[PDB]
Design a protein that fits this description.
The PDB classes it as transferase. The structure is a homodimer. Chain A folds into 2 domains: 189 residues, Rossmann fold (3-Layer(aba) Sandwich), CATH 3.40.50.11340; 167 residues, Rossmann fold, CATH 3.40.50. In chain A, a hairpin with a 2-residue loop joins strand 3 and strand 4. By secondary structure, the first copy, chain A, is α/β, with parallel strands linked by helices. The termini of chain A are far apart. In chain A, the strands form 3 sheets. In chain A, strands 5-2-1-8-6-7 form a 6-stranded parallel β-sheet. The first copy, chain A, has a 5-stranded parallel β-sheet with strand order 11-10-9-12-13, sandwiched between helices. In chain A, helix 7 packs across helix 13. Chains A and B meet through loops of A and loops of B. Bound molecules: guanosine-5'-diphosphate-beta-L-fucopyranose (2 copies). One guanosine-5'-diphosphate-beta-L-fucopyranose sits at the interface of chains B and A.
Chain lengths: 356, 356
């Protein structure tokens, strides 16, 4: 690709949060790239592994062919090898953020490589920045939500001088707007992940199966404990079950953090509802395999988990489930819901804990 | 003050940079508070002292009476004691920033108390935040530069629900826009600082005197070394000598970082130009007292510095000088220029190194 895009490129660090947060932003980055009509450089996703920061190529997890059906993309590999040499030489590498900020960890700026995963991400692809540009004065920043905003991007950063818009963090709302959720149709698991999910299913999961997502780490309970039921504002992915602006009801700590009793009761019920012959559990911590097996011991079915627990293949398995029960607050669960809603010709059944 | 402002308050951390950066932003914060018609809580200015972060009350450095002639203000002391108890109880304390960000040093947010001086600043006045609000979707953020922007602030954050807009960093452009520079008229040194400046002057500085600002730390030379004379964009305070958008000429490393020879030559010349009987030197590091004294040894005058070097009183002394020669890039020098331009009925003479 020595003939490059006359419109230029967007590259970004999915520098906020873990895989759920990253995917939730990436959907908005797709819609932003599409609107600007610049080619999107597909990110390396980030996985934290005490004390390694691991960059995972887009194409290891998801298929490029499929995402290309939404908008014009190149892989990070393509970008660094075929594109960067001729359109983005070291002296043109500027980072983009809302406003200059004070370094924590020295001239005011974006500080795109301060801290983790910020520095490792750009180090991975040999990028250092020589300057910062700011987009705060464009109405709504990267939203493209207000009149003149797209024009302003095009006016202020035209591709001739700015062939690459390089963003310190994903230029997208978090949590994602309802209007980007259907874009998850264009995220299809790689052959590797699908093979592994199918293998696990044939080896462990008598059909039909219920897949459940259990989010229960100490840090999660503590954010759930902060729910203000009177103000009732969105929290992370909560609009996935409660609708936009929470117009369907009230978010409670029972929804955010279902009790062990609530979980078992609901799992027992869902198993009965479809005549399930197995249960799959994905969790950040406690899979509750024993508690669930005791609860399902009457039905003569069992719960199964991945050993060790591969988050990406767990996501794939849950997307394949006959029935999925998720956590409505979690953006991890939200990946599953969007895939089940949008991946095929018709919605695959999904439920959430604490909601009926 | 148990009868509080129906329009509400703005409080902020001058969380970016040292005293120059802080004052340069504070001018814009004044204009922003004035435009919104909310009472401004005067900050504690921040001084870093390996390893103490020191908060200095506004009123120790500058006079409240004078700043009150620009817009409605209360001191931090007033705020915490008379205002906060009735209008801003712990459960209403929300921080305001452009957009949610990833913590470096855990839910996405403003992270208003992560790091130094961020945490110490709010700890000083016993504030913890229970929530974040974002203003990125208001066109130009805090600029008030675009149509509907002020209305949007008033619409989105009306004083009833939001009696206090508390900003993680100063809601103002950096570097400051030309249109806020005259606001420096309303920053008058406290009695303490003026007494000390007058004492030093009577004890050491035979009139008329030339005051010079010498900025020459290792970190400063290194930013100067980055000047792109072909693109010629503003750098920190450079528009103070080169006009807005650098329409008067080109910024060079000679202006940014005058050589030792350039400094002496120019000082010798300025001394001759007004028949100076002494020289005052303020510097971040090397005062060059010996080099200057050798250069002035023919004229039978000497250079004097403060021992130890009080930045605030040095600023006051330079504002009082018969002639001031500054560094055009430095926001520290810019405080002096603005004061000399605006404090009295008529401009007091100022020059910059490398420009004539
Ligand atoms: C507290 C908030 O939580 C939000 O988390 P939430 O939406 O659940 O979704 P994530 O952003 O993915 O954060 C949850 C992370 O925890 C691990 N995790 C959660 N569930 C599973 C699982 O079933 N299997 C495996 N292997 N790992 C799991 C995984 O690394 C995942 O990316 C964040 O997005 C916000 O940034 C914030 O931190
Ligand atoms: C590199 C950039 O430099 C910019 O500095 P610049 O405009 O000179 O102005 P300041 O933001 O004040 O940073 C310079 C600081 O260094 C010390 N300093 C400089 N001159 C003197 C002096 O004459 N006497 C004393 N006692 N101290 C001095 C002082 O603490 C002052 O606040 C920053 O605003 C930016 O944030 C960035 O760091």
């Amino acid at each position: 690709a020595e003939a490059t895009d006359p419109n230029g490129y967007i590259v970004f660090c999915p520098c906020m949060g873990r895989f759920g947060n990253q995917v939730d932003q990436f959907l908005g980055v797709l819609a932003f790239a599409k609107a600007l009509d610049r080619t999107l450089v597909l990110p390396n996703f980030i996985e934290f592994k005490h004390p390694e920061t691991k960059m995972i190529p887009f194409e290891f997890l998801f298929q490029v062919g499929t995402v290309a059906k939404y908008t014009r993309v190149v892989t990070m590999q393509e970008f660094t090898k075929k594109i960067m040499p001729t359109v983005w030489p070291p002296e043109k590498r500027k980072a983009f953020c809302w406003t200059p900020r004070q370094a924590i960890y020295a001239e005011p700026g974006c500080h795109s490589k301060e801290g983790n995963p910020f520095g490792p991400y750009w180090d991975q692809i040999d990028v250092s920045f020589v300057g910062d540009e700011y987009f705060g004065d464009i109405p709504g920043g990267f939203d493209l939500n207000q009149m003149g905003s797209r024009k302003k991007w095009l006016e202020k950063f035209p591709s001739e001088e700015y062939p690459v818009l390089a963003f310190s963090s994903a230029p997208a709302p978090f949590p994602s707007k309802g209007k980007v959720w259907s874009i998850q149709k264009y995220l299809r698991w790689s052959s590797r992940i699908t093979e592994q999910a199918k293998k696990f299913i044939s080896a462990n999961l008598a059909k039909p199966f219920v897949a459940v997502h259990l989010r229960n780490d100490a840090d999660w309970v503590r954010v759930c404990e902060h729910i203000d039921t009177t103000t009732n504002r969105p929290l992370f992915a909560s609009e996935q079950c409660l609708g936009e602006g929470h117009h369907l009801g009230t978010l409670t700590k029972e929804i955010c953090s279902p009790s062990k009793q609530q979980i078992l009761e609901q799992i027992v019920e869902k198993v009965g509802s479809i005549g399930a012959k197995s249960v799959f559990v994905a969790s950040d911590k406690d899979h509750m395999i024993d508690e669930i097996n005791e609860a399902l011991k009457p039905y003569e079915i069992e719960a199964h988990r991945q050993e060790p627990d591969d988050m990406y293949t767990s996501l794939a398995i849950m997307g394949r489930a006959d029935l999925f029960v998720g956590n409505c607050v979690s953006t991890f669960s939200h990946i599953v819901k969007r895939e089940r809603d949008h991946a095929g010709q018709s919605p695959r059944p999904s439920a959430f804990f604490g909601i009926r």
